[PDB]
Design an enzyme around this catalytic site. Structure first.
Site, PDB file in Angstrom:
ATOM      1  N   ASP A 180     -44.334 -34.426 -47.976  1.00  0.00           N
ATOM      2  CA  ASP A 180     -45.233 -33.319 -48.267  1.00  0.00           C
ATOM      3  C   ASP A 180     -46.215 -33.099 -47.141  1.00  0.00           C
ATOM      4  O   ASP A 180     -46.771 -34.046 -46.596  1.00  0.00           O
ATOM      5  CB  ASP A 180     -46.017 -33.591 -49.561  1.00  0.00           C
ATOM      6  CG  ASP A 180     -47.275 -32.728 -49.688  1.00  0.00           C
ATOM      7  OD1 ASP A 180     -47.173 -31.531 -50.038  1.00  0.00           O
ATOM      8  OD2 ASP A 180     -48.377 -33.254 -49.428  1.00  0.00           O
ATOM      9  N   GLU A 205     -41.752 -31.201 -44.701  1.00  0.00           N
ATOM     10  CA  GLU A 205     -42.305 -29.875 -44.891  1.00  0.00           C
ATOM     11  C   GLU A 205     -43.257 -29.491 -43.757  1.00  0.00           C
ATOM     12  O   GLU A 205     -44.475 -29.705 -43.804  1.00  0.00           O
ATOM     13  CB  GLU A 205     -43.031 -29.777 -46.245  1.00  0.00           C
ATOM     14  CG  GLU A 205     -43.320 -28.340 -46.706  1.00  0.00           C
ATOM     15  CD  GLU A 205     -44.768 -28.122 -47.169  1.00  0.00           C
ATOM     16  OE1 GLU A 205     -45.286 -28.927 -47.966  1.00  0.00           O
ATOM     17  OE2 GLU A 205     -45.384 -27.132 -46.739  1.00  0.00           O
ATOM     18  N   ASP A 291     -44.153 -23.640 -53.953  1.00  0.00           N
ATOM     19  CA  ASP A 291     -45.292 -22.995 -53.290  1.00  0.00           C
ATOM     20  C   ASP A 291     -44.979 -21.504 -53.118  1.00  0.00           C
ATOM     21  O   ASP A 291     -45.724 -20.642 -53.599  1.00  0.00           O
ATOM     22  CB  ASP A 291     -45.567 -23.595 -51.895  1.00  0.00           C
ATOM     23  CG  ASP A 291     -45.825 -25.096 -51.922  1.00  0.00           C
ATOM     24  OD1 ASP A 291     -46.497 -25.592 -52.853  1.00  0.00           O
ATOM     25  OD2 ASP A 291     -45.363 -25.782 -50.981  1.00  0.00           O
TER      26      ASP A 291
HETATM   27  O1  BGC Z   1     -47.791 -26.533 -48.263  1.00  0.00           O
HETATM   28  C1  BGC Z   1     -47.949 -27.929 -48.062  1.00  0.00           C
HETATM   29  C2  BGC Z   1     -48.518 -28.560 -49.293  1.00  0.00           C
HETATM   30  O2  BGC Z   1     -49.935 -28.234 -49.269  1.00  0.00           O
HETATM   31  C3  BGC Z   1     -50.684 -28.732 -50.392  1.00  0.00           C
HETATM   32  O3  BGC Z   1     -52.013 -28.364 -50.222  1.00  0.00           O
HETATM   33  C4  BGC Z   1     -50.118 -28.114 -51.687  1.00  0.00           C
HETATM   34  O4  BGC Z   1     -50.834 -28.585 -52.830  1.00  0.00           O
HETATM   35  C5  BGC Z   1     -48.657 -28.535 -51.813  1.00  0.00           C
HETATM   36  O5  BGC Z   1     -48.121 -27.959 -52.989  1.00  0.00           O
HETATM   37  C6  BGC Z   1     -47.835 -28.069 -50.594  1.00  0.00           C
HETATM   38  O6  BGC Z   1     -46.477 -28.640 -50.650  1.00  0.00           O
END
Ligand code: BGC
Ligand code: CA
Ligand code: CA
Ligand code: CA
Length: 404
Positions: A180, A205, A291
């Site tokens: 994440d 990600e 998201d």
């Molecule tokens: O976008 C990157 C990540 O950022 C975080 O602040 C969000 O809560 C996540 O849901 C997301 O996967």
């Protein structure tokens, strides 16, 4: 064959009875459909519900999602139908369970009797002044305002974290990782974690903005956007690494192309525009996630063209990841598994060859491995360009499929 499946959405935590338990009921359907991997949310205790504000890491039970028992109960059903399990690994930042000598919340509780992960402001990057004590290293990646960013250059951190990760596998059953917010720490750092815990695969990600025309639409040449992904993969061990990245490049380009501009699906080289056409074995393509779609909708896909996407990702090079809502709550169950089948029946994979046959604004046709041909778009006829010996097959709402 290899297909991923995000087994949850934003709202999932609300699920009466616990998300995992209701999921036990979706195991065969997912497995029978052709999936091979499932992506489950952050299992840990989280200040927030969905779990992206983790604290007591070893505290699995506190999760709004379900507890340690049920997670295994659920990961084992998956393993029973031969599907691997992915854990949403959130470590760029973390929330401290309690208040220190200064009043600032920087004293962490790992979630066990010992002091494992019972870190102090020392494990908080000194450049995240709002929490640090100024003695840690400097942030190796982006910062996350909402909470304390951990100093991954920290000897102890990389240690207790791999141990924790290694535990997730050895106890619960997790096989793979989904990193994440990877833009929060150098790939150099993801590498430390990936290698010392060796998952069947680690998809990260990394999500940067896409260059956009003055009119809000994304530009046509996205090379810079994707060079930043094949590069992050580059710096992580590439060929020899378990790591891979979600093809965000594809999402942005595809988001604008289904809108009567299919010509956007090809680069000057006769290749795909996303990471797909550059490094197809390290690109996890998708239609929407928790998201971009669901109830956060930061970047949703044209709802009336959501199938044109699956028709695209489930037959082209790259690893396709199917989105929950899409499989069970949008009236496309059948339509989707029919492709995965095609993709499976024809032995197509992350690296199959791609041969675009037509890339006009309202008509995109392609041949993958010379065994499959797909056409998405609103243009009744394209017979003109469909190689010899191609019988029709799967199709529907503005997409069609012909197998040799
Ligand atoms: O976008 C990157 C990540 O950022 C975080 O602040 C969000 O809560 C996540 O849901 C997301 O996967
Ligand atoms: Ca403890
Ligand atoms: Ca922060
Ligand atoms: Ca950070």
């Amino acid at each position: 064959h290899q297909v991923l499946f995000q087994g949850f959405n934003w709202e999932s935590w609300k699920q009466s009875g616990g998300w995992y338990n209701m999921m036990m009921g979706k195991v065969d359907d997912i497995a029978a459909a052709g999936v091979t991997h499932v992506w489950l949310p952050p299992p840990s205790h989280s200040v927030s519900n969905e779990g992206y504000m983790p604290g007591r890491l070893y505290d699995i039970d506190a999760s709004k999602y379900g507890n340690a028992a049920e997670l295994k109960s659920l990961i084992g059903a998956l393993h029973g139908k031969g599907v691997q399990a992915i854990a949403d690994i959130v470590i760029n930042h973390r929330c401290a369970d309690y208040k220190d000598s200064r009043g600032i919340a920087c004293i962490f509780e790992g979630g066990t009797s010992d002091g494992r992960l019972d870190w102090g402001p020392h494990m908080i990057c000194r450049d995240d002044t709002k929490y640090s004590d100024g003695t840690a290293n400097l942030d190796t990646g982006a910062d996350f305002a909402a909470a304390p960013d951990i100093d991954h250059l920290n000897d102890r951190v990389q240690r207790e974290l791999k141990e924790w990760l290694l535990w997730l596998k050895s106890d619960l059953g997790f096989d793979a990782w989904r990193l994440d917010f990877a833009r929060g720490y150098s790939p150099e750092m993801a590498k430390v974690y990936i290698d010392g815990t060796s998952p069947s695969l680690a998809v990260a990600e990394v999500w940067d903005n896409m260059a956009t025309g003055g009119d809000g639409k994304p530009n046509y040449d996205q090379d810079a956007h994707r060079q930043n992904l094949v590069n992050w993969v580059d710096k992580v061990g590439g060929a020899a690494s378990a790591g891979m990245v979600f093809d965000f490049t594809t999402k942005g380009i595809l988001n604008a192309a289904v809108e009567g501009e299919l010509w956007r699906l090809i680069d000057p080289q006769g290749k795909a525009p996303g990471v797909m056409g550059w490094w197809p074995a390290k690109a996890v393509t998708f239609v929407d996630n928790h998201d971009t779609g669901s109830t956060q909708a930061m970047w949703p896909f044209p709802s009336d063209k959501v199938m044109q996407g699956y028709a695209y990702i489930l037959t082209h090079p790259g690893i396709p990841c199917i989105f929950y809502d899409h499989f069970f709550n949008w009236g496309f169950k059948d339509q989707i598994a029919a492709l995965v089948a095609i993709r499976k029946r024809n032995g197509i994979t992350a690296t199959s060859a791609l041969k675009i046959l037509m890339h006009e604004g309202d008509a995109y046709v392609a041949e993958i491995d010379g065994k499959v041909v797909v056409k998405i778009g609103s243009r009744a006829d394209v017979g003109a360009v469909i190689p010899a010996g191609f019988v029709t097959s799967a199709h529907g709402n503005d997409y069609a499929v012909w197998e040799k």
